[PDB]
Amino acid sequence: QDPLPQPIYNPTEQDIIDLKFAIADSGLSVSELVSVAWASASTFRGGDKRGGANGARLALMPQRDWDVNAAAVRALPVLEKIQKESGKASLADIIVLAGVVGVEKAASAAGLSIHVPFAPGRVDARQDQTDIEMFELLEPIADGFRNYRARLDVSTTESLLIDKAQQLTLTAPEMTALVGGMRVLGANFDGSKNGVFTDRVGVLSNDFFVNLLDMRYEWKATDESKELFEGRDRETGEVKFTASRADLVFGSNSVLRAVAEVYASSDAHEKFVKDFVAAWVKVMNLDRFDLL
C-alpha cells in the first residue's frame, strides 16, 4: 500500500487564471508548450481506451522515454514544479493547459487574442496503474504532425499520417489546419526545418499554406528514397525550403490540396486561426466523453 488516495482537485476559474499566469512566465517557449501538450494528447486511438491526455502518462514510463517525446520531455520538469507549487490542478490538466497558453501566445504574436477553450477534470495516473507492457504498444511508428518517422518501412509516410489522423478521429480540414499550424509553431520533434515554411517560427500564421501553394517554387526529391524534397525558386534555382512526404501531400494530393487551398491566402488568416483552435481543442478532449 502506497497509502493515501491521489488528491482530488477542483480548480476554480481563478485557479486556472493563475496557472496560466505561472505557465506564461516560466520561460517555456511556444514550441515547448505546444510539444508537451501534443505529446500528451496524441496517443489517443479511436476505439481503444488507453491513449489521450487524461492520466499525464507522458510523465511516466514508457512514454517519458520515447524518442519522439524528447522535446516534450524537456518542459515536463518546469510544469511538474508548477503543479507541485500550486496543488490546485492535476499535472494532466496542467499539461493540456500548457498547450492552451502556448497556442494563445502564438496567436497573440500574430495579432489575434483568441480564447482557447479548456476542460478541467483530468487526473494523474500512478506508475503502478500504468502497465508498462501495454503502453509500449502505442509508441508511434510515425507522427507526421511532428514530422516524426521511425523505421522507413514497407508502409508510406503519407499513408501513416492518414492512419494517425484517423486514429485521432480528425477530418481532412482538421488534419490540415493542425499540420499547418504545428509546422510554423515549431512542433517538429527534432527542430527540423522540414515543412517550416516561415521566417516567424512560433507565430500562428497561415504561412505553411501560402508558401506550400506558391507556384514560384518547384519541388524535387533529393535522392531515390524520395523521402526528402527541396523546393527551389524557379528563377534562381536556389533552394528555399525542404519538406518530407508528410508536408508535401497537402500540395501533391489533389484531394488534400483541395482542403489545403482554402487556407492558402489571405484575409484568410483569421479563419485558419479559428479552425486551428477548434481542431487543437478537439484533440485535447478526445478522451473526454469518448463514446468510442
CA angle 280, 186, 222 (to 5 degrees): 115
What was the resolution (in A) of this experimentally determined structure?
A: 2.0
* Burial class (CB within 10 angstroms; exposed 0-12, middle 13-18, buried 19+) of 173: middle
Q: Which CATH architecture has domain 140-267?
A: Orthogonal Bundle (1.10)
Cell of 63: 512514454
Residues forming a β-bridge with 148: 143
Structure method: X-ray
The CA–CA distances, whole Å, from 252 to 23, 33, 243, 269 equal 39, 31, 12, 22
Instruction: Give the residue extent of every domain in the chain.
Output: 1-139+268-292, 140-267
SS3 239: strand
Helix, strand, coil shares of the chain, percent, nearest 5, are 50, 10, 45
**DSSP summary character for residue 128:** G
- The Cα–Cα gap between 210 and 31 comes to 21
CATH 3.20.20.70 fits 1-139+268-292, yes or no: no
* Burial class (CB within 10 angstroms; exposed 0-12, middle 13-18, buried 19+) of 54: buried
